[PDB]
Design a protein around this ligand. Sequence first.
Ligand code: HEM
Ligand code: HEM
Ligand SMILES: CCCCCCCCCC
Ligand SMILES: CCCCCCCCCC
Ligand SMILES: CCCCCCCCCC
Length: 206
Amino acid sequence: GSAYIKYYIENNWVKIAFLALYVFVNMFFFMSAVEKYESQGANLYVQIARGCGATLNLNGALILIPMLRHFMTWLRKTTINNYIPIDESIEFHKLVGQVMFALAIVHTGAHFLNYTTLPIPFAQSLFGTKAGISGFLLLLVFIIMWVTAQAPIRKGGKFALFYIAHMGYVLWFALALIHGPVFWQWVLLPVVGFIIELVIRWKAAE
Ligand code: HEM
Ligand code: HEM
Ligand SMILES: CCCCCCCCCC
Ligand SMILES: CCCCCCCCCC
Ligand SMILES: CCCCCCCCCC
């Protein structure tokens, strides 16, 4: 109840601040994209779709970081771990993945609604544009990864199905790079993360 919550907040204030920053940064990129498209005379569907898209870039930058296992294991042993629990890296990964799935659904729905406002048939917008085709494929990949990563499957005896489907992350990243064609800079964060992971693996290697 109330007493437990006060205790929790006091003991995890850095973690809470981290998450509040995560929320704030999502809101900033979302609203920034909304304001941009709105100033161009875009309808509300476009504004929402673009807002989701901007936050999808942001979360796409973050999703892999907690899964750089040697880097997280190194970090767990630094004084950073006295402030924020690096053991919860997987819980942050899961959170970023759920947020992204919600945003992907909204982005998809908003783009579908925007397709109805065009003097072009729906099927030509969805299966006759680069963005439609790549987006649909990216959506399917993501649905497959998301469904199989849920605990009833992943922890309920179908770990192998989860694990093989999750190797789709490679395909996910390829498609995202093909789908969001102008702004590829988001991937610099994981690229840097991956270089740190390689350096750490090298240092520990024989
Ligand atoms: C059928 C499903 C989808 C459709 C119809 C769709 C449609 C679009 C369209 C029309 C754009 C603008 C492309 C451009 O400016 O050249 C776009 C951009 C983007 N989409 Fe999708 N998309 C879909 C699924 C997804 C999924 C599943 C994700 C992420 C997991 C995603 C992430 C993005 C991102 C990051 C951008 C670039 C930022 C932006 O302009 O909003 N999309 N999408
Ligand atoms: C686009 C979305 C996602 C990407 C790109 C992604 C990527 C990854 C990667 C690269 C790994 C490490 C794989 C390895 O061990 O070799 C991983 C592990 C994991 N991911 Fe995701 N992931 C996504 C979404 C999700 C979602 C939505 C969930 C859960 C709701 C999730 C749960 C996990 C879990 C639990 C692991 C750890 C498996 C284990 O160590 O037992 N992921 N993810
Ligand atoms: C403003 C948003 C802050 C989110 C913190 C929630 C912490 C829940 C830990 C279980
Ligand atoms: C979730 C949004 C539903 C999209 C409606 C589009 C109907 C297209 C058929 C012409
Ligand atoms: C009006 C014809 C629309 C056909 C498009 C099929 C959309 C598949 C949604 C998953």
